[PDB]
Every structure is written in C-alpha cells, then in structure tokens.
C-alpha cells in the first residue's frame, strides 16, 4: 500500500526499463503502433480491409488451397515465426539464459501460446485483426463465415482480447507481464524449479510497482492481471482441443511440424 524509494525498488524500476527495451527490439509491432493504426491516426498506415471473399482475393495483390485452409495455414506459419521472436525476447530476461537449457525449452514450449494470445489482443478490436504487420485488417465476421471447422478457431481469441484490452495496459506493462508468464514454475518437466521461481518472484514485484506508478487511477490491476493469467491457460486448452478436431476431421491439410511437437504435450 505504501512504497519508499529504496535500492530494491530501484532495481525493480531498472529491470522494467530493461525488459521494455528488449521488448521494443524483439517485436515488430508494439501495442502503441497497433492501436494508432486501429484508431486511424497513423499516416503511413491504413490497412487494406479484408471483409469478404472478394476483398480477400483482391487483397492478395497488395500482399488443396481452399480459403478456409489457406488462411488456417497462414496462422500456423505466423505462429512459428512468433515463437522465434518470443524466444529471442525470452533470452533477454535476466537469468533465463543461466537456467538449465532443458528448462529454458520447457518454459518456452509451454508458455509461448499464452504469450501469443496476449500480444494478439494488441492487434485486435471488436471489429477484427491487423494482419501482415499492419498491412491488412481481417474482419471478425469474415472469420466466422469460414467453412464449418475453421469458423471458430479465432472467436475465442477475440472474446479474450476485448475483455483484456479493457485493462488498458501499455507496452510498459506488457513487457513485464509477458516475462512473468514465461518464467512459471508450474511447467511440467522442469529440472530445478527454485531458481525459476526466484526469478518470477522478483518479476512479479517489478510488475506490481510498474502498475502502481503507471496506473495511478486503477485500484487493482495487479489482482486482475493475476486472474487473466489463469484464463489464458484455459484459452490455450480450448485451442488445443478444437485444434485436434481439425486434425481428425479435416485432412489433405497439414499442421506445421514444430507446432505439432508442442501440441503433443498439451491438454
């Protein structure tokens, strides 16, 4: 409830700057940029709106192949690419690199998806998603119209994004939040758990201090973020389920191998 400016709170503020710089340098599109585009104030940015099949095809001009599938495999590709960016960002979290290599992989392997939907929310609004780094905007209604199986793989994301963007976190907050998610000792298969929690503990303190200074008006964002952290795991779960329905239903369409390795160890 009360804070003093001590050497410990100073490092927590330093850690914040650090993860923030790594963040900006690890991800192409930040929430600041994303929201600017969605509110239309960017000059160089004005996404081509894909809101139907006709706009979809003419949109492919400005940057087994049925659309429902074509679009589905596009997401899995962006996902592995996203994985690589998350990984690069993870390596910049202090201590992460000193953990047993095996745990570093277990950590990413299990939390990359929780991070993927947290950051996807930055690119989402009640109307749709920004695709191809702000070059396109794909309408939410257009995604639900897709073929029987692929018409719901995105809807859960959207529902989450809306509730989530409600908290109005800025990239300052996300940089640390994402770090907390990664370094979770709950992950099955870790060798030495204590060192991981030690890092998370300190990350959680830094996050709370961040939220007090950055959101003077919000009474309890911290408690709310801790909750969003749980319903994130639920979304991943539901994602894996519906994802298995696509496997044993829709064939003549392949799931990227790197992703299937992660899905194997997910429930």
- According to DSSP, the residues that pair with 125 across neighbouring strands are 128
Structural tokens at position 63: 């940057």
Residues 90, 253: Cα–Cα separation, whole Å: 32
**1-267 has which fold?**
Retinoid X Receptor (1.10.565)
String of b and e for 61-99 (b: at least 16 CB within 10 Å)?
eeeeeeebbebbeeebeebeebbeebbebbebbeebeeb
What is the C-alpha separation between 70 and 53, in angstroms, rounded?
12
3-class SS shares of the chain: helix, strand, coil, % to 5: 65, 5, 30
How open is the CA angle 137-128-154, to the nearest 5 degrees? 115
What distance in Å separates the CA atoms of residue 122 and residue 168, rounded to the nearest whole number? 10
Q: How was this structure determined?
A: X-ray
Quickly count: other Cβ atoms within 10 Å of residue 148's Cβ.
9
Rounded Cα distance between 101 and 195, Å, is 13
CA 238 – CA 261 distance, rounded (Å): 17
Q: How far is residue 107's CA from residue 104's CA, in Å, rounded to a whole number?
A: 5
Chain centre distance of CA 255 = 20
Give just the sign of the alpha carbon dihedral 81, 87, 88, 93. Answer: positive
Instruction: Give the residues across from 137 on adjacent strands.
Output: 49, 130
Cβ-contact 156, 235 below 8 angstroms: yes
Cα 255–256–261 angle (5° rounding)? 95
Residue 38 burial (CB count, 10 A): 21
- What 3-state DSSP class applies to 84? helix
> Under a CB-based contact definition with an 8 Å cutoff, are residues 224 and 133 in contact?
no
Residue 228 tokens read as 């969003």
Binding-site residue set for rosiglitazone: 76-79, 113, 239, 263
Place of tokens 């060192």: 195
d(CA 144, CA 128) in angstroms, rounded, equals: 11
Within a 13 Å sphere around the CA of 62, how many CA atoms are in the beta-carbon half? 14
* Calpha distance 207→212 (Å, rounded): 9
Element (H, E) at 170: none
Please name the residues in contact with 130: beta carbons below 8 A apart, sequence gap of 6 or more: 29, 34, 37, 38, 47, 123, 124, 136, 137
Q: Are 234 and 37 in contact (CB under 8 A)?
A: no
SS3 assignment, position 34: helix
Between CA 13 and CA 182 the distance in angstroms is: 20
Domain ranges within the chain, ordered by starting residue: 1-267
Q: What are phi and psi of 105, to 5 degrees?
A: -75, -45
Dist. CA 248–CA 94, nearest whole Å: 42
For CA atoms 182, 186, 188, 194, give the dihedral sign: positive
Instruction: Look at the block and give the residue holding tokens 């589905």.
Output: 72
Annotated binding site: 76-79, 113, 239, 263
**Category of 189 on φ-ψ map: left (φ > 0), alpha (ψ -120 to 50) or beta:** left
């Amino acid at each position: 409830a009360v804070h003093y400016l001590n050497p410990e709170s100073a490092d927590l503020r330093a850690l914040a700057k650090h993860l923030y710089d790594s963040y900006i340098k690890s991800f192409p599109l930040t929430k600041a940029k994303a929201r600017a585009i969605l509110t239309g104030k960017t000059t160089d940015k004005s996404p081509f709106v894909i809101y139907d099949m006709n706009s979809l095809m003419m949109g492919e001009d400005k940057i087994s192949k049925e659309v429902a599938i074509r679009i589905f495999q596009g997401c899995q590709f962006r996902s592995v690419e996203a994985v690589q960016e998350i990984t690069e960002y993870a390596k910049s979290i202090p201590g992460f690199v000193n953990l047993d290599l095996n745990d570093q992989v277990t950590l990413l392997k299990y939390g990359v998806h929780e991070i993927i939907y947290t950051m996807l929310a930055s690119l989402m609004n009640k109307d749709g998603v920004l695709i191809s780094e702000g070059q396109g905007f794909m309408t939410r209604e257009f995604l639900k119209s897709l073929r029987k199986p692929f018409g719901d793989f995105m809807e859960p994301k959207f529902e989450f994004a809306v509730k989530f963007n409600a908290l109005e976190l800025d990239d300052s907050d996300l940089a640390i939040f994402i770090a907390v998610i990664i370094l979770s000792g709950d992950r099955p298969g870790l060798l030495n758990v204590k060192p991981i929690e030690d890092i998370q503990d300190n990350l959680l303190q830094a996050l709370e201090l961040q939220l007090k200074l950055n959101h003077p008006e919000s009474s309890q964002l911290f408690a709310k973020l801790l909750q969003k952290m749980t319903d994130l795991r639920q979304i991943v779960t539901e994602h894996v389920q519906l994802l298995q329905v696509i496997k044993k239903t829709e064939t003549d369409m392949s799931l990227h191998p790197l992703l299937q390795e992660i899905y194997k160890d997910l429930y």
